[PDB]
């Protein structure tokens, strides 16, 4: 399968799961995996990434993702290092039926033991509004 097909299928499955069961998102990640999903710290600085399933799960449950709606406007995916796939995503994400918020996101997906199985090594997500606004 092409990098683009792997990337598009991942993006649909990720944002589907974020709606149906965000408590299970951690299942995509490993012990060396990175995750950030926007946010501003108590100093107004973009929130820090966390590492590994335990902290990623904690951070995801912190977002209180509820009934989230997703509009995927752009997906680009290239082959990368070690037969991985780097995915660039732009779109809009609505949480708890509030306004859609523009986002800019990068995943690095890497071969998992099973054929055409991938895990998320890196998940970089930023809302535009906290960075440009």
């Amino acid at each position: 399968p092409s990098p683009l097909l792997v990337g598009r299928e991942f993006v649909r499955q990720y944002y589907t799961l974020l709606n149906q069961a965000p408590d299970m998102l951690h299942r995509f990640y490993g012990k060396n995996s990175s995750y950030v999903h926007g946010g501003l710290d108590s100093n107004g600085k973009p929130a820090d990434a966390v590492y590994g399933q335990k902290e990623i799960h904690r951070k995801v449950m912190s977002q209180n993702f509820t009934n989230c709606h997703t509009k995927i406007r752009h997906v680009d995916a290239h082959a990368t290092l070690n037969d991985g796939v780097v995915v660039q995503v732009m779109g809009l994400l609505s949480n708890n039926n509030q306004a859609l918020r523009r986002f800019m996101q990068t995943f690095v997906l890497a071969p998992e033991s099973v054929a055409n199985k991938f895990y998320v090594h890196n998940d970089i997500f930023r809302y535009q509004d906290e960075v440009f606004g």
Binding site: Y14, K117, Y119
Partner: peptide, 8 residues
């Protein structure tokens, strides 16, 4: 098929 999940 294409599947996703972290390593064991």
């Amino acid at each position: 098929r294409i599947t996703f999940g972290g390593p064991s």
